[PDB]
Amino acid sequence: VTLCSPTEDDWPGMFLLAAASFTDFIGPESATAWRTLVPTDGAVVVRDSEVVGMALYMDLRLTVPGEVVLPTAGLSFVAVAPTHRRRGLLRAMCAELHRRIADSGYPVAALHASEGGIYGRFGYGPATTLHELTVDRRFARFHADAPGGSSVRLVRPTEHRGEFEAIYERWRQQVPGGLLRPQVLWDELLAEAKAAPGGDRESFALLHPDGYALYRVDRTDLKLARVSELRAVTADAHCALWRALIGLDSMERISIITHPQDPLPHLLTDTRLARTTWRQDGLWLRIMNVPAALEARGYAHEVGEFSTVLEVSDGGRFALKIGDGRARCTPTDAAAEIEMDRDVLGSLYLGAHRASTLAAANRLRTKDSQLLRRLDAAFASDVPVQTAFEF
């Protein structure tokens, strides 16, 4: 058992481990495309010789509150062979990548979790919430107040790549959780848009000047349309796209994986028709550099200037001053007023979780209820946090 950066000769062994580890493995051709987002020294492997462990990160750009874009290490392709469980391989690989990520100057790392119980101990907190809405469209009537009572076109996704790219680029820059989508991921997305023999049905697009929806009929439930992606830059675009989706008269149900503040239910005369059928953690964040991350994002202007001392468990103690929507975060040995593990700060960082809620679980410790209210207000995001694409 040695831990190394993989050579070109290691990648066939990594693809075997991937195929055996991930039921959703994209195959070697697609994986080779995703590889283009992994920097030199972005990957580690454990050899016994065959590959028994692997982990890597990709260079991402993540939007945080205040429309600030952070360089982000996106952890992915993490696997330990079923032959090598309970040997500390995950711990060793995560320790090495975190060392490389921190030394490289990334203020944050991010991942999507295979299970909810693994990444908390490595300092990752769930930072976005996936919210599945299922609409019984047979009953759906738009409210008198709903915009645009057409601006929308039914199109083939592959024929309107430029328009989707431009709309997505506008969306990702204005929404916390937004990720830059590089050209290789557009190539991959539009390749998946076509039907597969015994696989997915053909994808269609609804295109508005200021939004698009990509959807396909479910493989097995032929009365369910699944929206894979809806990106709307305006309220008018969001409503117009939903009027078109409710117009899919051959379907009983439209489902979408969205965010908790999706205004869809409020567009209907019966809010209950937009049923929450599933909820899960989306993007997870590890704050690598506490002061750099905390100084980088914008804060709520509504809360008056306040100062506190924040201790992150084995992450430093800082004088934190928040006023006029900006934070200053400097080293101190002054007594801590707030204490939390690193994972908890990740959960607060995009505004998806309230300091008050985490305090009620004793994940966040303070003796000052006023300070808790100020933190809740300051860390809150004006623009609701969304999830961009899984990686």
Ligand X SMILES: O=C(CCCN1CCC(O)(Cc2ccc(F)cc2)CC1)c1ccc(F)cc1
By CB under 8 A, name the one of 71, 88, 116, 331 that touches a copy of itself: 116
Ranked by CB distance to Cl ion, the top (closest) residue is 386
Least CB distance to Cl ion at residue 232 (A): 11
By CB under 8 A, name the one of 185, 300, 309, 336 that touches a copy of itself: 300
Burial letters 74-90, b for 16+ CB under 10 A, else e: bbbbbbbbeeeeeeebb
- In this structure, the strands spanning 306-312 and 338-340 are parallel
Burial letters 98-117, b for 16+ CB under 10 A, else e: bebbeeeebbbbbbbbeeee
Judged by beta carbon, residue 181 or residue 208, the one nearer a copy of itself is 208
By CB under 8 A, name the one of 3, 16, 31, 38 that touches a copy of itself: 16
What residue 156 binds from Cl ion, a copy of itself, ligand X, none (CB within 5 to 8 A, per partner kind)?
Answer: a copy of itself
Supply φ then ψ for residue 154, to 5 degrees.
-80, 115
**Residue 248 touching a copy of itself (CB under 8 A):** yes
Q: How far apart are CA 269 and CA 141, in angstroms?
A: 6
Give the 3-state secondary structure of residue 140: coil
Residue positions counted in the chain: 391
Least CB distance to ligand X at residue 390 (A): 4
Chain contacts with ligand X (rule: CB under 6 A): 24, 26, 31, 34-35, 38, 56, 58, 76-77, 390-391
Distance of CA 372 to CAs 313, 357, 366, 368, Å? 18, 10, 8, 7
124 is catalytic: no
The two most distant CA atoms of the chain are separated, in Å, by 67
Considering only residues 74 through 93, tell me which ones interact with a copy of itself, judged by CB under 8 A.
80-85
C-beta neighbour count of 96 within 10 angstroms: 16
Least CB distance to a copy of itself at residue 103 (A): 29
391 is catalytic: yes
- Pattern 121-150, a copy of itself, x by CB under 8 A: -----x-----------xx-x-x-xxx--x
Count of chain residues binding a copy of itself (CB under 8 A): 91
Residue holding tokens 């010789």?
Answer: 49
What residue 387 binds from a copy of itself, Cl ion, ligand X, none (CB within 5 to 8 A, per partner kind)?
Answer: Cl ion
What residue 390 binds from Cl ion, a copy of itself, ligand X, none (CB within 5 to 8 A, per partner kind)?
Answer: ligand X
Considering only residues 35 through 64, tell me which ones interact with a copy of itself, judged by CB under 8 A.
48, 50
By CB under 8 A, name the one of 3, 5, 6, 22 that touches a copy of itself: 22
In terms of phi and psi (left: phi > 0; alpha: psi -120 to 50; beta: otherwise), the region of 27 is left
Considering only residues 318 through 357, tell me which ones interact with a copy of itself, judged by CB under 8 A.
341, 354, 356-357
Question: Is the separation of the CB atoms in 105 and 138 below 8 Å?
Answer: no
What residue 226 binds from a copy of itself, Cl ion, ligand X, none (CB within 5 to 8 A, per partner kind)?
Answer: none
Least CB distance to a copy of itself at residue 261 (A): 5
Judged by beta carbon, residue 190 or residue 233, the one nearer ligand X is 190
Burial letters 249-271, b for 16+ CB under 10 A, else e: eebbbbbbbbbeebebeebbeee
In terms of phi and psi (left: phi > 0; alpha: psi -120 to 50; beta: otherwise), the region of 77 is left
Judged by beta carbon, residue 58 or residue 254, the one nearer ligand X is 58
Of the residues 57, 77, 119, 124, which is catalytic? 119
Q: How far apart are CA 209 and CA 297, in angstroms?
A: 30
Binding site members for acetyl-CoA: 78-80, 86-91, 114-115
**CA angle centred on 66, ends 63 and 67, rounded to 5°:** 40
Binding site members: 78-80, 86-91, 114-115
Chain contacts with Cl ion (rule: CB under 5 A): 259, 386-387
Tell me which residues are annotated as active site.
Answer: 119, 391
